[PDB]
Ligand binder design. Structure first.
Ligand SMILES: *[C@@H]1O[C@H](CO)[C@@H](O[C@@H]2O[C@H](CO)[C@@H](O[C@@H]3O[C@H](CO)[C@@H](O)[C@H](O)[C@@H]3O)[C@H](O)[C@H]2NC(C)=O)[C@H](O)[C@H]1NC(C)=O
Ligand code: NAG
Ligand code: NAG
Ligand code: NAG
Ligand code: NAG
Ligand code: CA
Ligand code: CA
Ligand code: CA
Length: 1131
């Protein structure tokens, strides 16, 4: 139940108990709020006697103003409409500005006419003490003045609740001294439609209100409409709702547009862009506007059902607009963004100090000093790009790439070596660019950057300092080994190694691709070079921040700047010269943007001016086809290039051999691989040519293993420069000419120092070596080391969607992202498409924009039967599900493990951590905030409208269960969130405290599951949380990481007496003294057979920390009394 008080009419009031009167004040009087423990207060602002604005104050800190013309303020600043915040979801319900606070309990509406409203909860029975009268069934005692004296004059009682504020003084409001046939409202007691209500609230007070209005009622046929509408609303709230009224004489309650004032319009209000979530429309009917019928409510006005625009990247799109992604394209069907399914060309950017972007985008930093295999065909060896990395800037965390050694085997056996400084060394001797061959076309670019180009499949962009940009066509598809990983479009597996197993650590994966056996394997890959050079932190942050500024806002939606921001920070803190490396990082992000399709200037005086040579000009977005006298000499070769942003020359000019461009029609006449000056006639025995313009117009020691050095024929044999070790036997070793050293017998590889047979050499996993025939367990799969290669058993294991922290999620395929949501979102769901759905898990929360101490997650599990809502700290089942057979509520440890079906095994932390575990059955059939469980991480941001979104914010906003609540604003901030950014003191302590994840206790597990996602989740969600007393915000993240570790059989006992202590004393506390049975076990077992659950169950998680009773062998545990007793004393 709930009461209702409305400041309807013109200066009228209706208390919570029915008493009504007139009062035109000016001092923003207190409508409702307890007088003992206020904790919040609805204030009805008044202007010159008119009802202007309805304010709500929470405690003494949060101020919200609603106004009657739709504008909103926080007290000193304006805000947009949906404006979800700490409670107080201010929305538009049915054309009326609704302000809903449920944690406290009330709902404030302001319809077009300006009639306020309030729906206080029963828990304020006899407790509210505002201007709307105390909420007691007795309606005659609703003039309780703030002084505590019950008066009879309404104006005295009303003025006793005035609330002045600073400039807004006030005085005793007094009734206007104005005195006085439209008898229309007499029908309140005559017409049948109203007559039905007579058993309910009587009309006589409303007839008196008529007479009072009618006395003046300045206007025409309006003296009655306010009272009639108020009576109808009061009757509807009291029970039955007057159907059919407003068809006789009412003023047609105003609506913004699409005039459809309709009694009992469901607030669910299926709108234009909604997920069609049925069964959540349980909210009671409320009188309000609506769309005519066939129309559907769009963002603003009503539009036709067949006109719903598609939404992508947080903007609207008329049907059929069909914008194009990188290489695929979408069509914008009826809000479905049907998209193509081609394969785009890959790229393996290697820019920066040590930064890689695998073909399947897997931004990572390795920083190893050796020769590493970047990309290779493997399936059909046709190119073996290899990089040689060497430390720069006399700092450990600075490992540039010095050269590249492409090994195109098609052209006999070429060894094109893109040297430092943009030189090329085809098979030893340097070569004068441009160069042509069978298909090789290495040549300069507009910028000083060699561009190797094989037969329209390879395309490199070496640039000297180091920028390799290997680009492959879809032909190579999923056949490409090397540091760029298989080019199969899935970013998850791009950490594979020659042994055939993905390395969880970047270091192991990188070391796997060594060529020289003597190079040092990389240890922990430091993430913060700034720590070694503190003087650079300020400049690094303040300079790389530009990547997250309006200058790059256009590209922000196309390419997420986070990896590029991290790379810029690392380079600036690590590079030898801050200026050049900063410009390189910014140019890298800009180039990524431009290649995606968006061009950003980002180049300003001082910052990164290109400073083109005299005679050249910058002209961002220039054309490269022309701008070479050679181009004139060969005017029918090709032109299929685009904007390059290089240093071109003024129109009408032409690059010459020397480099200048003053030549316009005085150009060399490149011909037969020779240079001819202008007008250089020439006549051989079978032709005669003259060079005009630019075109050459023409007519007519240690036994027992054998020792060999090399044949020394042309320095081809493999000397000691590369000795085939089983760790690198498969890899293509570099060829630096014969060194004339030792070598193992041809039919067996080297190992350590003793040469051993190839079939007998251990594989590797996490650095550790495993001898042939051994085996290792990965998840629910086991692998055996054979021929230095892992043979794994393929059983797709259960995927675990999670919501680490409050703003971070972990998809089934493994993607982790940030989404600070407030509304109710679809965590998991199988109502994706043609497949008939079976369940929907919604993870709606409250006050969780910024992860806060009071944030709480409300999970509603709409299984086939009905809601299984989880809230607070216990499970509620507000529906008997159709098949209660498959339903358990095992609450081992601190968790509420559920088994809602054969596969669905939701695991709950009794707090803000929720895990959904699915089996092979729900593969590629699920959708929501946790991807689709297809094994591909890239396609896990697919929005509700079946399009991939770069920014996780838009993708999350696409999954809100409602469609009017609010959309999380795309915050451009970076690491060090708001409460973390400008604190330093809090930033540092948070960073240090959220480092236990890398402590010794977690050290054993860190090598099995990287903590960086959880490090971020802890640095975030801990600065955001103002943990006071309740220290769960920080502790919960660590506990979640420990739980993940335990899932991998790496139990960690990290809790202490001073670090997130967890006690169990209260359980053992019993009338019999002390039981000593309930103790905290860091891991504990899974669901334990108990009196209420004698039979065993297949729990999703084998181990779960928390309290548990270590009962002796007999007398298994009970449930109600939380004590273990003989099996007899239970059912
Ligand atoms: C809905 O009603 C509210 C309440 O009247 C309107 O707020 C008022 O908006 C006007 C528009 O500019 C404000 O005028 C400006 O005030 C500032 C500060 O006093 C002054 O420096 C300017 O020169 C200008 O006069 C006015 O202050 C403001 N009153 C408030 C906030 O109490 C609101 O504009 C209305 N909605 C719409 C859409 O108009
Ligand atoms: C209102 O409060 C007073 C004192 O707390 C109490 O005596 C009285 O019974 C209350 N009224 C109702 C209806 O509970
Ligand atoms: C170069 O190409 C541009 C674009 O097609 C064209 O306008 C121009 O005439 C060409 N020649 C020169 C010398 O710029
Ligand atoms: C896996 O083992 C089976 C049985 O020994 C064998 O037939 C199969 O070839 C093995 N797979 C690989 C990739 O070696
Ligand atoms: C937790 O329980 C398991 C199995 O019951 C046991 O092996 C382990 O020693 C326990 N740990 C502690 C700290 O009691
Ligand atoms: Ca009362
Ligand atoms: Ca891949
Ligand atoms: Ca997927």
């Amino acid at each position: 139940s709930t009461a209702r008080c409305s400041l309807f009419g013109s200066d009228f009031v209706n208390t919570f108990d029915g008493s009504m009167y007139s009062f035109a004040g000016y001092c923003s009087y207190l409508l409702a709020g307890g007088c003992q423990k206020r904790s919040f207060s609805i204030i009805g602002d008044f202007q010159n006697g008119k009802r202007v604005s309805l304010s709500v104050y929470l405690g003494e800190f949060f101020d919200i103003h609603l106004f009657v013309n739709g504008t909103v303020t926080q007290g000193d600043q304006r805000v947009s409409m949906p404006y979800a915040s700490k409670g107080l979801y201010l929305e538009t319900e049915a054309g009326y500005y609704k302000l809903s606070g449920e944690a406290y309990g009330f709902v404030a509406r302001i319809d077009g006419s300006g009639n306020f409203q309030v729906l206080l909860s029963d828990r304020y029975f006899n407790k509210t003490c505002g201007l709307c009268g105390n909420f007691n069934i007795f309606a005659e005692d609703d003039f309780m003045t703030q002084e505590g004296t019950l008066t009879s004059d309404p104006y005295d009682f009303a003025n006793s609740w005035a609330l002045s504020s600073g400039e807004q003084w006030c005085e005793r409001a007094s009734p206007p001294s104005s005195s006085c046939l439209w008898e229309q409202c007499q029908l309140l007691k005559s017409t049948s439609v109203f007559a039905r209500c007579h058993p309910l609230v009587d009309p006589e007070p409303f007839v008196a209100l008529c007479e009072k209005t009618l006395c003046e009622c300045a206007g025409g046929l309006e003296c009655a409409c306010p009272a009639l509408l108020e009576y109808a609303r009061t009757c509807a709230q009291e029970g039955m709702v007057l159907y059919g009224w407003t068809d006789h004489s009412a003023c047609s309650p105003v609506c913004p547009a699409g005039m459809e004032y309709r009694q009992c319009v469901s607030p669910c209000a299926r709108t234009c862009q909604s997920l069609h979530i049925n069964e959540m429309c349980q909210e009671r009917c409320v009188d309000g506007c609506s769309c005519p019928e066939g129309q559907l409510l769009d963002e603003g006005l009503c539009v036709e059902s067949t006109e719903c625009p598609c939404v992508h990247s947080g903007k609207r799109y008329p049907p059929g607009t069909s914008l194009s992604r990188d290489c695929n394209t979408c069509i914008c069907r009826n809000s479905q963004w049907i998209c193509s399914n081609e394969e785009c060309p890959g790229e393996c950017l290697v820019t920066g100090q040590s930064h890689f972007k695998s073909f399947d985008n897997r931004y990572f930093t390795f920083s190893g000093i050796c020769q590493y295999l970047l990309a290779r065909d493997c399936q059909d060896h046709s190119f073996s790009i290899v990089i040689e990395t060497v430390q720069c800037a006399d700092d450990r965390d600075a490992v540039c790439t010095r050269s590249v050694t492409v090994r195109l085997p098609g052209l006999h056996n070429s060894l094109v070596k893109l040297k430092h400084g943009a030189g090329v060394a085809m098979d030893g001797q340097d070569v004068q660019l441009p160069l042509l061959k069978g298909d090789l076309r290495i040549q300069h670019t507009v910028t000083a950057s060699v561009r190797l180009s094989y037969g329209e499949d390879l395309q490199m962009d070496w640039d000297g300092r180091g920028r390799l940009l290997v680009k492959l066509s879809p032909v190579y598809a999923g056949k490409t080994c090397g540091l760029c990983g298989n080019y199969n479009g899935n970013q998850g597996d791009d950490f594979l190694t020659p042994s055939g197993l993905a390395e969880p650590r970047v270091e192991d994966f990188g070391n796997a691709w060594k060529l020289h056996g003597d190079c040092q394997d990389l240890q922990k890959q430091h993430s913060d070079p700034c720590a070694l050079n503190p003087r650079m932190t300020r400049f690094s942050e303040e300079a790389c921040a530009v990547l997250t500024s309006p200058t790059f806002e256009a590209c922000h939606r196309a390419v997420s700047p986070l990896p590029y921001l991290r790379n810029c920070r690392y380079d600036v803190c690590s590079c030898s010269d801050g200026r050049e490396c900063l410009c390189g990082a910014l140019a890298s992000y800009a180039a990524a943007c431009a290649g995606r399709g968006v061009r950003v200037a980002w180049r300003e005086p001082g910052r990164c001016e290109l400073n083109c040579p005299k005679g050249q000009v910058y002209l961002q977005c220039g054309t490269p086809c022309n701008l070479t006298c050679r181009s004139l000499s060969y005017p029918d070769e090709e032109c299929n290039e685009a904007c390059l942003e290089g240093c071109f020359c003024p129109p009408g000019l032409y690059m010459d051999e020397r480099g200048d461009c003053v030549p316009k029609a005085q150009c060399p006449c490149y011909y037969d691989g020779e240079i001819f000056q202008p007008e250089d006639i020439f006549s051989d025995h079978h032709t005669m040519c003259y060079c005009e313009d630019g075109f050459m117009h023409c007519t007519m020691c240690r036994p027992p293993m054998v020792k060999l050095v090399c044949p020394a024929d042309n320095l081809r044999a493999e000397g000691l420069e590369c000795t085939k070790t089983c760790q690198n036997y498969d890899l293509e070793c570099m060829s630096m000419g014969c060194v004339s050293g030792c070598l193992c017998p041809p039919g067996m590889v080297r190992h350590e120092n003793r040469c051993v047979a190839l079939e007998r050499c251990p594989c590797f996993h996490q650095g550790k070596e495993y001898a042939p025939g051994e085996t290792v367990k990965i998840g629910c799969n086991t692998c055996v080391c054979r021929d230095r290669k892992w043979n794994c058993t393929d059983h797709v294991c259960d995927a675990t969607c999670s919501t680490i922290g409050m703003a971070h999620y972990l998809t089934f395929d493994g993607l982790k992202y940030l989404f600070p949501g407030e509304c109710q979102y679809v965590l998991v769901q199988d109502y994706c498409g043609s497949n008939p759905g079976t369940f929907r898990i919604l993870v709606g929360n409250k006050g969780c924009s910024h992860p806060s101490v009071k944030c709480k997650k409300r999970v509603t599990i709409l299984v086939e039967g009905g809601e299984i809502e989880l809230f607070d700290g216990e499970v509620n089942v507000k529906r008997p599900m159709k098949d209660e057979t498959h339903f358990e509520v095992v609450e081992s440890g601190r968790y509420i493990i559920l088994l809602l079906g054969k596969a669905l095994s939701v695991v709950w932390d009794r707090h803000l951590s929720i895990s959904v575990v699915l089996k092979q059955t729900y593969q590629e059939k699920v959708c929501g905030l946790c991807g689709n469980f297809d094994g591909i991480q890239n396609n896990d941001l697919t929005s509700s409208n079946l399009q991939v979104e770069e920014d996780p914010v838009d993708f999350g906003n696409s999954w809100k269960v409602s469609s009017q609540c609010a959309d999380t604003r795309k915050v451009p901030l970076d690491s060090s969130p708001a409460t973390c950014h400008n604190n330093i003191m809090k930033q540092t302590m948070v960073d240090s405290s959220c480092r236990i994840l890398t402590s010794d206790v977690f050290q054993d597990c860190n090598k099995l599951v990287d903590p960086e996602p959880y490090l971020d989740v802890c640095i975030y969600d801990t600065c955001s949380c103002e943990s006071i007393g309740d220290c769960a915000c920080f502790c919960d993240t660590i506990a979640a990481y420990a739980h993940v570790c335990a899932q991998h059989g790496k139990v960690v006992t990290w809790r202490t007496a001073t670090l997130c202590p967890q006690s169990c004393e209260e359980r053992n506390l019993r009338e019999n003294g002390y039981e000593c049975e309930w103790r905290y076990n860091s891991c504990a077992p899974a669901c334990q057979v108990t009196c209420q659950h004698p039979e065993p169950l297949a729990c999703p998680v084998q181990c779960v920390e928390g309290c548990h009773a270590h009962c002796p062998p007999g007398k298994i545990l009970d449930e109600l009394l939380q004590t273990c007793v003989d099996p007899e004393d239970c059912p």
